[PDB]
Structure 1
Amino acid sequence: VLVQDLLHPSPATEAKQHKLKTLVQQPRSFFMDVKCQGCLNITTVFSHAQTAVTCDSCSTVLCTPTGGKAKLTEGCSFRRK
């Protein structure tokens, strides 16, 4: 392809790119609001969390760290902020 709009790439091909290989690099991670099943208390958790985060109310582990995104424990529902 000799002629191509480099300033306005197609968002479909833009979304398959590596996070550092876009026009302006931007993280693909996010922050979540985690509802444990026992109670209702907003606890902000990083999507790619490296810590076994526990909510303040009840000392229950919300997520277990993995290679990539943190894995939420059973009964824990997340909502992206």
Structure 2
Amino acid sequence: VLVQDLLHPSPATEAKQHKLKTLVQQPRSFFMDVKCQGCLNITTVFSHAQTAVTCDSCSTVLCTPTGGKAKLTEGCSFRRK
């Protein structure tokens, strides 16, 4: 591959490369709106949350931190912002 277009990489390989090794680095994390089972209230939760985030509605933890993404509790739904 003597000649290839570095300025316009294929999207498939960009989704596979490291978040730092892209042409312009951009986080793969995001923010979540978690609808808990008990009630419906908008709450922004980081995908890679380090804290056991509770909702102001109910004193119930929404996610438990893990090595990577925050693991959502059963009965809770999320939607990506």
TM-score bucket of the superposed structures, by smaller chain = over 0.9
CA distance in 2, matches of 1:71, 1:60: 14
Aligned-residue Cα RMSD (Å) equals 0.4
> What SS class does the counterpart of residue 33 from structure 2 fall into?
strand
User: Could you tell me the TM-score, scaled by structure 2's length?
Assistant: 0.99
**What residue is the counterpart of 2:34 in the other structure?**
34
1:52-77 CA deviation, whole Å, 9 max, x = no partner?
00000100000000000000111000
% same residue: 100
Offset, 1:14: 1.2
Runs (5+) with no aligned partner, structure 1: none
Number of residues paired by the alignment? 81
Runs (5+) with no aligned partner, structure 2: none
> What SS class does the counterpart of residue 34 from structure 1 fall into?
strand
Following TM superposition, where does structure 1 have runs of at least 4 consecutive aligned residues deviating by more than 3 angstroms?
Answer: none
CA distance in 2, matches of 1:73, 1:12: 31
User: Could you tell me the TM-score, scaled by structure 1's length?
Assistant: 0.99
> What SS class does the counterpart of residue 14 from structure 2 fall into?
helix
**What residue is the counterpart of 1:12 in the other structure?**
12
